[PDB]
Amino acid sequence: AMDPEFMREFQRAAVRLHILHHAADNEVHGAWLTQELSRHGYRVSPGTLYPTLHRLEADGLLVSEQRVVDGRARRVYRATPAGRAALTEDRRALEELAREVL
């Protein structure tokens, strides 16, 4: 990239937004988020993603639940009401900036 600092800063925000958007549509496992983010073109390792997930729950924007499904313990994440509101606000900021420069 010509502007690696922009890409670096912008990716953090992009990831955060994608996590919230996916977790508002439906419940998600961390492992699936890694694959899904990759499909959308973001290079993310579990080592980077899980701390983001935990932070989002700490921020009250996600909530996780322990589930035992098919003899296997798994954590699922979903958006809280605060998360859906955050998503609206974040999307709004994106849309505004998109409208302005494009």
Binding site, residues? 22, 36, 40
Tell me which of Zn ion, its own copies, none is bound by residue 69, counting a contact when its beta carbon lies within the kind-specific cut-off of 5 to 8 angstroms: none
61 binds its own copies (CB under 8 A): yes
Residues 19-48 that bind its own copies (CB under 8 A): 20-21, 40-41
> Exposed/middle/buried for 47, CB within 10 Å: 0-12, 13-18, 19+?
exposed
C-beta of residue 29 within 8 angstroms of C-beta of residue 74 = yes
Burial class (CB in 10 A: 0-12, 13-18, 19+), 95: exposed
**Between 11 and 50, how does the x/- string for binding to Zn ion read (CB under 5 A)?**
----------x--------------x---x----------
101 near Zn ion, judged by CB under 5 A: yes
Size of the site for Zn ion (CB under 5 A): 5
In order of 37, 69, 70, 73, 100, the CA distances from 15 in angstroms are 8, 27, 30, 26, 22
By the criterion CB under 8 A, which residues form the site for its own copies?
1-7, 9-10, 12-14, 16-18, 20-21, 40-41, 55, 59, 61, 82, 85-86, 89-91, 93-98, 100-102
